[PDB]
């Protein structure tokens, strides 16, 4: 019922990652909450969009509907992600 | 008045001349013949209207729920 990219996104909670939306908005910061439906809630987040309007916010919440991609660090790509 | 659900309103609108406008701007005006539970429409003797001007008659026209924006009973 839980996917392996969903488990990799849930296991990467608490690290400095980024989420690029379909409109180009990149919410970067520490992934505080990551649900099974790609709901990313971050604290002390930073908005760096394709528009380029870079700002800093206390809390941000991006849903999985308009989420295009997610850039995660390579600390979890070795184990236990080796299948 | 009384709160009416949209499904008996769509069931009772069969046989009456209505007009269904889509999201692309075009509308089809005709008598509603068939309306299922998936919000699909099938009309007879339909006429096409674009930008407030009539285009032509087509007859039986089937419009799905993914493209139809609104419907008004005339």
């Amino acid at each position: 019922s839980i996917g392996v990219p969903i488990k990799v996104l849930h296991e990467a909670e608490g690290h400095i990652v980024t989420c690029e939306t379909n409109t180009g908005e990149v919410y970067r910061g520490k992934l505080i909450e990551a649900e099974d439906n790609m709901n990313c809630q971050m604290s002390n987040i930073t908005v760096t969009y394709r528009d380029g309007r870079v700002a800093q916010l206390e809390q941000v919440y991006i849903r999985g509907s308009k989420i295009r991609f997610l850039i995660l660090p390579d600390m979890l790509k070795n184990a236990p992600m080796l299948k | 008045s009384l709160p009416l659900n949209p499904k008996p309103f769509l069931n009772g609108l069969t046989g009456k001349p209505v007009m269904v406008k889509l999201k692309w701007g075009m509308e089809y005006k005709g008598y509603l013949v068939s309306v299922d539970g998936y919000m699909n429409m099938q009309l007879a003797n339909t006429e096409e209207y674009i930008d407030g001007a009539l285009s032509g008659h087509l007859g039986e026209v089937l419009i799905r729920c993914n493209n139809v924006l609104y419907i008004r009973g005339v």
Binding site: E35, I45, E58, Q59, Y61, I62, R63, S65, K66 | -
Partner: protein, 74 residues
């Protein structure tokens, strides 16, 4: 399945929501929904020129919700 979004920490907090077509609103959330529908009481929407217009209690659906940023420290 059908898990609700984690909106318990953002309850009764002034947040700014972004809607499709480049819409921006700001208001206090008054509830949650499993379909990502948010009720914003005393909401103020930003116009194109920059003026804020108070629309009151509004309901935003999850199909057009882009990003919600909390303006208060939770």
């Amino acid at each position: 399945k059908a898990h609700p979004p984690e909106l318990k920490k953002f309850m009764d907090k002034k947040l700014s929501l972004k809607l499709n077509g480049g819409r921006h609103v700001q208001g206090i959330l008054r509830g949650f929904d499993p379909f990502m529908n948010l009720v914003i009481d005393e909401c103020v929407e930003m116009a194109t020129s920059g003026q804020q217009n108070n629309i009151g209690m509004v309901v935003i659906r999850g199909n057009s919700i882009i990003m919600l940023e909390a303006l208060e420290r939770v």
